[PDB]
């Protein structure tokens, strides 16, 4: 899967370092071929950003992450819709804070009762990405693969 | 034990999500019969919530929970039943506190909870400890 130094919001979280990542060796025409593509690892494309919700009592505008209170449970993310919200992986929701930053820096926390009367959607893939830090192997102590 | 998707209040303290919950793969008749039953994961009910309570030091009204701290180990909560209080889990005690309600359960002391008298009235059987370790039915399809 493709990765570009530049973007500092995806690199961070992941675990990846700019300079590390430009400092990657080569790779041989014949493996190139020999392993499949996978899609790439970018900022998720939220649709119709910033537009107002559909449904009511939503808690933002469209593409805004919400978090409910430690005090009741293990904290689950998530993202509002437009026609809805959709649940979001721990690794993902702090990707999409860092690259939506604009300067902010926390969800917004909601109490269990007012998330239970919006409705629940899914129009996001977030199948790329890991659940949880690359485990990035020193290319200098195993050089062939 | 039969569960619910739109109910939060049970879902966030037990670990489970909406999305796990809805897309769950079938199962078979067969498999359905040979398993017992069990009691619905449901916000246990209480009779005649907010009445009055019929014994003498009673910290609040029925359906109230108690909680008390100690000198070492876990603090205890407790819930108030037209005859008296039971104790509840930790675990438990949040199925409650998660369902709009009071901010925080009643502080009380030791001594007095101590000389209070005892209940064993409702069915806590289905709850556990912690948060439940959901198996991934990718790697093991089959049960």
């Given at each position: 899967?493709?990765?570009?130094?530049?973007?500092?919001?995806?690199?961070?979280?992941?675990?990846?370092?700019?300079?590390?990542?430009?400092?990657?060796?080569?790779?041989?025409?014949?493996?190139?071929?020999?392993?499949?593509?996978?899609?790439?690892?970018?900022?998720?494309?939220?649709?119709?950003?910033?537009?107002?919700?559909?449904?009511?009592?939503?808690?933002?505008?469209?593409?805004?992450?919400?978090?409910?209170?430690?005090?009741?449970?293990?904290?689950?993310?998530?993202?509002?819709?437009?026609?809805?919200?959709?649940?979001?992986?721990?690794?993902?929701?702090?990707?999409?804070?860092?690259?939506?930053?604009?300067?902010?820096?926390?969800?917004?926390?909601?109490?269990?009762?007012?998330?239970?009367?919006?409705?629940?959607?899914?129009?996001?893939?977030?199948?790329?990405?890991?659940?949880?830090?690359?485990?990035?192997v020193d290319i200098r102590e195993?050089?062939?693969?």
């Amino acid at each position: 899967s493709r990765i570009e130094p530049t973007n500092r919001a995806v690199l961070l979280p992941l675990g990846l370092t700019p300079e590390q990542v430009s400092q990657a060796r080569p790779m041989s025409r014949a493996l190139f071929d020999a392993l499949p593509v996978g899609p790439e690892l970018l900022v998720p494309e939220v649709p119709n950003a910033g537009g107002p919700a559909t449904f009511p009592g939503a808690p933002g505008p469209i593409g805004t992450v919400i978090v409910t209170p430690q005090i009741s449970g293990p904290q689950q993310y998530s993202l509002v819709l437009g026609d809805g919200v959709q649940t979001l992986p721990p690794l993902v929701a702090q990707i999409l804070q860092n690259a939506g930053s604009a300067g902010n820096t926390k969800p917004l926390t909601v109490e269990p009762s007012t998330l239970a009367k919006m409705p629940v959607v899914n129009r996001l893939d977030l199948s790329a990405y890991p659940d949880n830090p690359l485990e990035v192997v020193d290319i200098r102590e195993h050089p062939s693969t």
